[PDB]
Amino acid sequence: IERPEDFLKDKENAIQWEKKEAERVEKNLDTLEKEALELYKKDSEQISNYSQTRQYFYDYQIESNPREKEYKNLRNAISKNKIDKPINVYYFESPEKFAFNKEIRTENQNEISLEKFNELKETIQDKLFKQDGFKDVSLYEPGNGDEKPTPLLIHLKLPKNTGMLPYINSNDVKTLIEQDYSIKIDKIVRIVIEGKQYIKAEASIVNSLDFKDDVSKGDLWGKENYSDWSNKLTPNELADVNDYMRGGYTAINNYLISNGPLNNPNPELDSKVNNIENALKLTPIPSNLIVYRRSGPQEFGLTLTSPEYDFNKIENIDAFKEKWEGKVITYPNFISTSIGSVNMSAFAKRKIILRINIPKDSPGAYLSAIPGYAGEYEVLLNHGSKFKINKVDSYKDGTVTKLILDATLIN
Numbered sequence: 001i002e003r004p005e006d007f008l009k010d011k012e013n014a015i016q017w018e019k020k021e022a023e024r025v026e027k028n029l030d031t032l033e034k035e036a037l038e039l040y041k042k043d044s045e046q047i048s049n050y051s052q053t054r055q056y057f058y059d060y061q062i063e064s065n066p067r068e069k070e071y072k073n074l075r076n077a078i079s080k081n082k083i084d085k086p087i088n089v090y091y092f093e094s095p096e097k098f099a100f101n102k103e104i105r106t107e108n109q110n111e112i113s114l115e116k117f118n119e120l121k122e123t124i125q126d127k128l129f130k131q132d133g134f135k136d137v138s139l140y141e142p143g144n145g146d147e148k149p150t151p152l153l154i155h156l157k158l159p160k161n162t163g164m165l166p167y168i169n170s171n172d173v174k175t176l177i178e179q180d181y182s183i184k185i186d187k188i189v190r191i192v193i194e195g196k197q198y199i200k201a202e203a204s205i206v207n208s209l210d211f212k213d214d215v216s217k218g219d220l221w222g223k224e225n226y227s228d229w230s231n232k233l234t235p236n237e238l239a240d241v242n243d244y245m246r247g248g249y250t251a252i253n254n255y256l257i258s259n260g261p262l263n264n265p266n267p268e269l270d271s272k273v274n275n276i277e278n279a280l281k282l283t284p285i286p287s288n289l290i291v292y293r294r295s296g297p298q299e300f301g302l303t304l305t306s307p308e309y310d311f312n313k314i315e316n317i318d319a320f321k322e323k324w325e326g327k328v329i330t331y332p333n334f335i336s337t338s339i340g341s342v343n344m345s346a347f348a349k350r351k352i353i354l355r356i357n358i359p360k361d362s363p364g365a366y367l368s369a370i371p372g373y374a375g376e377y378e379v380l381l382n383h384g385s386k387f388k389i390n391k392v393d394s395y396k397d398g399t400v401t402k403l404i405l406d407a408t409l410i411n
């Protein structure tokens with residue numbers, strides 16, 4: 001264990017240790033892995049952008065995408081070298097990455113105002129931001145002579161068995177990792193580097209199961225944890241869950257959406273809602289989990305024809321973010337989600353993807369585990385759930401621009 005957990009400002013020693021590690025690791029790489037790495041060090045932009053949105057297309061599209069082969073080989077090379085002890089890394093990020101769509105300070109100013117610092121603090125306070133894709137990080141705190149692209153520096157601690165790939169490009173050593181978690185900013189402080197102030201954000205990792213395009217593995221997990229869910233429900237609860245799935249969902253959910261429980265109380269429907277809710281609390285979600293929902297425009301106050309629903313125009317995206325980013329949306333109805341991120345027929349035309357982080361022990365059930373409900377990958381969430389929208393991103397799906405909403409269940 002000839003390595004500290006954090007090299008701090010000691011650049012010289014950080015580089016010396018990593019230079020050797022790089023040489024060591026490269027000898028454990030296959031021709032294909034080396035191939036991919038060479039392509040990366042020549043065009044990081046494309047490959048990185050791809051690694052961030054690859055999971056949202058049809059399974060058919062993913063398999064035939066040229067970049068998929070590159071992604072898989074690079075992904076393998078990374079997970080190849082798991083660190084034996086934790087390590088802290090450093091990297092500069094754009095504030096926009098955290099929904100702070102303003103400037104902390106210009107490149108010419110040296111100080112950061114109190115107002116700006118408080119506004120940033122409140123924006124990236126109690127929020128989990130999902131991170132995905134390849135990213136180059138540094139093992140030491142930037143200093144005199146180092147590149148400082150933005151006024152925001154992230155100091156992140158990576159867990160024991162995190163994959164990390166030290167590599168040599170031209171003459172300098174670099175570190176590649178693949179983000180597959182959520183980050184929480186615990187504290188932000190001002191630090192000065194060469195006369196200029198920078199925000200240093202102390203960040204921690206929050207892990208969650210995210211099957212992404214691997215629907216088969218997610219289905220296996222869902223069946224394993226809910227195979228006997230139906231066998232534990234009382235006759236009444238089973239009958240109501242069955243009715244709900246058999247077509248009763250429309251009446252039940254319409255009743256909830258129109259505030260029936262408080263505007264036109266229906267004893268028969270309230271009973272079913274109660275049994276279904278209790279059924280969802282019988283076997284709470286076993287661990288932190290990410291689910292996906294392709295939403296219709298109505299869920300966000302729009303219609304298929306609404307002019308603001310055309311995200312191909314950047315004006316409409318900005319309008320959407322001003323209204324929903326950082327806000328909380330409440331679903332009166334029970335809400336269906338999928339354990340997989342892949343696009344599917346029937347939802348192919350929807351433009352809004354809600355990517356929800358479900359905390360361990362939240363109510364929920366894998367409906368596709370019920371006898372006579374296969375190849376559906378469905379997770380049902382409780383009625384009245386509240387989701388905090390942390391960030392809005394966009395990507396192009398063919399000729400249509402679509403949105404990805406990074407949200408957290410906060411019920």
Ligand SMILES: NC(=O)C1=CN([C@@H]2O[C@H](COP(=O)(O)OP(=O)(O)OC[C@H]3O[C@@H](n4cnc5c(N)ncnc54)[C@H](O)[C@@H]3O)[C@@H](O)[C@H]2O)C=CC1
Binds near residue numbers: 292299332336347
């Ligand atoms: N949308 C998804 O991502 C997934 C849907 N499914 C299943 O596939 C089937 C059909 O898909 P959907 O049309 O999504 O069915 P849905 O049963 O969830 O809802 C039908 C319609 O009501 C909506 N709606 C829901 N909450 C609303 C709210 N709070 N305010 C205004 N409008 C609201 C949707 O916009 C949708 O057009 C469903 O039976 C569902 O269980 C399965 C996995 C994922």
